[PDB]
Amino acid sequence: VNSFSGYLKLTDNVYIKNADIVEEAKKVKPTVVVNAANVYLKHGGGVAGALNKATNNAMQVESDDYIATNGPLKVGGSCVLSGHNLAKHCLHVVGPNVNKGEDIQLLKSAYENFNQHEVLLAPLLSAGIFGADPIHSLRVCVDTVRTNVYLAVFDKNLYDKLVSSFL
Ligand SMILES: O=C1CC[C@@H](c2cccs2)N1Nc1ncnc2[nH]c3ccccc3c12
Protein backbone atom coordinates (compact mmCIF):
# COMPACT_ATOMS: atom_id res chain seq x y z
CA VAL A 1 0.00 0.00 0.00
CA ASN A 2 1.22 3.50 -0.92
CA SER A 3 -0.13 7.05 -0.67
CA PHE A 4 -1.05 7.69 -4.33
CA SER A 5 -4.74 8.50 -4.82
CA GLY A 6 -7.17 8.62 -7.73
CA TYR A 7 -5.09 6.77 -10.34
CA LEU A 8 -6.47 4.53 -13.07
CA LYS A 9 -4.73 1.14 -13.20
CA LEU A 10 -3.51 0.43 -16.73
CA THR A 11 -1.48 -2.75 -16.05
CA ASP A 12 -0.06 -4.69 -13.12
CA ASN A 13 2.39 -1.86 -12.35
CA VAL A 14 1.46 1.20 -14.48
CA TYR A 15 -1.06 3.77 -13.21
CA ILE A 16 -2.17 7.07 -14.76
CA LYS A 17 -3.91 10.25 -13.56
CA ASN A 18 -4.86 13.70 -14.87
CA ALA A 19 -2.78 15.85 -12.52
CA ASP A 20 -0.05 18.47 -12.15
CA ILE A 21 3.12 16.59 -11.19
CA VAL A 22 4.28 19.55 -9.07
CA GLU A 23 1.14 19.57 -6.91
CA GLU A 24 1.11 15.78 -6.87
CA ALA A 25 4.72 15.70 -5.67
CA LYS A 26 4.05 18.36 -3.02
CA LYS A 27 1.12 16.32 -1.66
CA VAL A 28 2.55 12.79 -1.80
CA LYS A 29 6.24 13.58 -1.17
CA PRO A 30 7.15 10.39 -3.05
CA THR A 31 10.47 8.62 -2.74
CA VAL A 32 11.23 9.43 -6.40
CA VAL A 33 9.85 12.10 -8.71
CA VAL A 34 11.01 11.90 -12.33
CA ASN A 35 12.05 15.07 -14.12
CA ALA A 36 11.82 15.46 -17.91
CA ALA A 37 15.44 16.61 -18.12
CA ASN A 38 17.82 17.61 -20.89
CA VAL A 39 21.48 16.59 -21.02
CA TYR A 40 22.63 19.92 -19.54
CA LEU A 41 20.08 19.81 -16.71
CA LYS A 42 18.88 23.28 -17.75
CA HIS A 43 15.38 23.32 -16.27
CA GLY A 44 13.83 26.12 -18.28
CA GLY A 45 10.37 25.02 -19.33
CA GLY A 46 7.95 22.18 -19.51
CA VAL A 47 7.95 19.78 -16.58
CA ALA A 48 11.55 20.65 -15.70
CA GLY A 49 10.86 24.37 -15.48
CA ALA A 50 7.84 23.69 -13.29
CA LEU A 51 9.63 21.33 -10.90
CA ASN A 52 12.55 23.72 -10.59
CA LYS A 53 10.35 26.76 -9.90
CA ALA A 54 8.64 24.82 -7.12
CA THR A 55 12.07 24.28 -5.49
CA ASN A 56 12.78 28.04 -5.56
CA ASN A 57 15.63 27.33 -8.06
CA ALA A 58 17.45 24.97 -5.66
CA MET A 59 17.10 22.18 -8.23
CA GLN A 60 18.92 24.34 -10.80
CA VAL A 61 21.70 25.27 -8.35
CA GLU A 62 22.29 21.61 -7.51
CA SER A 63 22.11 20.66 -11.18
CA ASP A 64 24.69 23.24 -12.27
CA ASP A 65 27.14 21.84 -9.72
CA TYR A 66 26.42 18.31 -11.00
CA ILE A 67 27.15 19.31 -14.61
CA ALA A 68 30.28 21.27 -13.65
CA THR A 69 31.64 18.08 -12.04
CA ASN A 70 30.34 15.37 -14.38
CA GLY A 71 29.51 16.92 -17.73
CA PRO A 72 26.25 16.41 -19.61
CA LEU A 73 24.04 13.36 -19.40
CA LYS A 74 23.47 11.06 -22.36
CA VAL A 75 20.20 11.15 -24.26
CA GLY A 76 18.43 8.13 -22.78
CA GLY A 77 20.39 8.50 -19.54
CA SER A 78 19.65 9.73 -16.05
CA CYS A 79 21.05 10.85 -12.74
CA VAL A 80 19.69 10.80 -9.19
CA LEU A 81 19.74 14.14 -7.37
CA SER A 82 17.85 15.60 -4.44
CA GLY A 83 14.07 15.88 -4.54
CA HIS A 84 14.29 19.10 -2.49
CA ASN A 85 10.83 19.98 -1.07
CA LEU A 86 9.03 17.76 -3.62
CA ALA A 87 10.32 14.21 -3.01
CA LYS A 88 13.19 12.37 -1.39
CA HIS A 89 15.00 12.05 -4.73
CA CYS A 90 14.59 13.43 -8.23
CA LEU A 91 15.47 11.06 -11.07
CA HIS A 92 16.42 13.35 -13.96
CA VAL A 93 15.75 11.35 -17.13
CA VAL A 94 16.62 12.54 -20.65
CA GLY A 95 14.04 11.44 -23.18
CA PRO A 96 14.83 12.19 -26.83
CA ASN A 97 13.73 15.64 -28.00
CA VAL A 98 12.04 15.30 -31.38
CA ASN A 99 12.39 19.06 -31.85
CA LYS A 100 16.18 18.50 -31.77
CA GLY A 101 16.20 15.56 -34.20
CA GLU A 102 16.94 12.90 -31.58
CA ASP A 103 16.20 9.22 -32.22
CA ILE A 104 12.83 8.18 -30.78
CA GLN A 105 14.26 4.68 -30.27
CA LEU A 106 16.12 6.19 -27.30
CA LEU A 107 12.79 6.58 -25.48
CA LYS A 108 12.93 2.93 -24.42
CA SER A 109 16.43 3.43 -22.98
CA ALA A 110 15.12 6.49 -21.10
CA TYR A 111 12.28 4.51 -19.51
CA GLU A 112 14.68 1.69 -18.54
CA ASN A 113 16.10 4.05 -15.92
CA PHE A 114 12.80 3.76 -14.04
CA ASN A 115 13.48 0.07 -13.34
CA GLN A 116 16.19 1.04 -10.84
CA HIS A 117 13.47 2.39 -8.50
CA GLU A 118 10.68 0.38 -6.93
CA VAL A 119 8.07 3.20 -7.08
CA LEU A 120 8.10 6.49 -9.00
CA LEU A 121 5.93 9.50 -9.79
CA ALA A 122 6.63 10.47 -13.38
CA PRO A 123 5.54 12.39 -16.48
CA LEU A 124 5.34 10.87 -19.93
CA LEU A 125 8.86 11.10 -21.27
CA SER A 126 9.50 13.00 -24.51
CA ALA A 127 5.91 14.35 -24.50
CA GLY A 128 5.04 18.04 -24.29
CA ILE A 129 7.83 20.29 -25.54
CA PHE A 130 10.05 17.29 -26.36
CA GLY A 131 7.82 16.70 -29.38
CA ALA A 132 6.99 12.98 -29.25
CA ASP A 133 3.51 11.44 -29.48
CA PRO A 134 2.23 10.93 -25.90
CA ILE A 135 0.25 7.83 -26.94
CA HIS A 136 3.50 6.22 -28.11
CA SER A 137 5.32 7.35 -24.97
CA LEU A 138 2.67 5.64 -22.84
CA ARG A 139 3.03 2.43 -24.89
CA VAL A 140 6.81 2.41 -24.44
CA CYS A 141 6.40 3.09 -20.72
CA VAL A 142 4.01 0.15 -20.27
CA ASP A 143 6.23 -2.16 -22.33
CA THR A 144 9.50 -1.13 -20.61
CA VAL A 145 8.91 -0.19 -16.97
CA ARG A 146 8.44 -3.14 -14.61
CA THR A 147 8.51 -1.21 -11.33
CA ASN A 148 5.49 0.69 -10.02
CA VAL A 149 5.02 3.92 -11.96
CA TYR A 150 2.41 6.60 -11.24
CA LEU A 151 2.03 8.81 -14.31
CA ALA A 152 0.78 12.38 -13.91
CA VAL A 153 -0.71 13.89 -17.06
CA PHE A 154 -1.24 17.64 -16.87
CA ASP A 155 -3.65 18.09 -19.79
CA LYS A 156 -7.15 16.83 -18.97
CA ASN A 157 -8.03 16.41 -22.64
CA LEU A 158 -4.82 14.47 -23.29
CA TYR A 159 -5.43 12.17 -20.32
CA ASP A 160 -8.84 11.12 -21.64
CA LYS A 161 -7.35 10.45 -25.08
CA LEU A 162 -4.60 8.26 -23.58
CA VAL A 163 -7.10 6.25 -21.52
CA SER A 164 -9.74 5.84 -24.22
CA SER A 165 -7.12 4.73 -26.75
CA PHE A 166 -5.12 2.50 -24.39
CA LEU A 167 -4.82 -1.09 -25.56
O1 LIG B 1 0.22 16.35 -19.45
C2 LIG B 1 1.24 16.23 -20.05
C3 LIG B 1 1.59 15.18 -21.10
C4 LIG B 1 2.91 15.61 -21.73
C5 LIG B 1 3.52 16.68 -20.78
C6 LIG B 1 4.03 17.87 -21.53
C7 LIG B 1 3.21 18.75 -22.18
C8 LIG B 1 3.93 19.81 -22.81
C9 LIG B 1 5.26 19.70 -22.62
S10 LIG B 1 5.68 18.33 -21.69
N11 LIG B 1 2.38 17.06 -19.89
N12 LIG B 1 2.40 18.13 -19.03
C13 LIG B 1 2.37 18.12 -17.62
N14 LIG B 1 2.78 16.93 -17.04
C15 LIG B 1 2.78 16.87 -15.66
N16 LIG B 1 2.42 17.84 -14.80
C17 LIG B 1 2.04 18.98 -15.43
N18 LIG B 1 1.64 20.08 -14.70
C19 LIG B 1 1.30 21.10 -15.60
C20 LIG B 1 0.86 22.35 -15.23
C21 LIG B 1 0.58 23.23 -16.24
C22 LIG B 1 0.74 22.82 -17.57
C23 LIG B 1 1.19 21.55 -17.92
C24 LIG B 1 1.50 20.61 -16.94
C25 LIG B 1 1.97 19.24 -16.85
Residues 61 and 52: their CA atoms lie apart, in Å, by 10
Residue 153 lies in a domain: yes
Residues 43 and 23: their CA atoms lie apart, in Å, by 17
Q: At residue 17, what are phi and psi to the nearest 5 degrees?
A: -150, 145
| Count of domains observed in the chain | 1
Q: What is the resolution of this structure in A?
A: 1.0
Q: Dihedral sign, CA of 13, 116, 30, 85?
A: negative
The CATH number linked to 31 is 3.40.220.10
Residues 76 and 65: their CA atoms lie apart, in Å, by 21
- Sequence-ordered list of residues with C-beta below 8 angstroms from that of 46, at least 6 positions apart, any chain: 36, 128, 129, 130
- Structural domain for 46, as ranges: 8-163
Residue 69 lies in a domain: yes
Residue 1 lies in a domain: no
Residue 33 lies in a domain: yes
Ligand 1, from 47, 139, 158, 165: best to mutate by most atoms within 8 Å of Cβ? 47
Residue 76 lies in a domain: yes
Q: At residue 122, what are phi and psi to the nearest 5 degrees?
A: -150, 155
Residue 3 lies in a domain: no
Query: From ligand 1's centre to the CA of 69, what distance in Å?
Result: 30
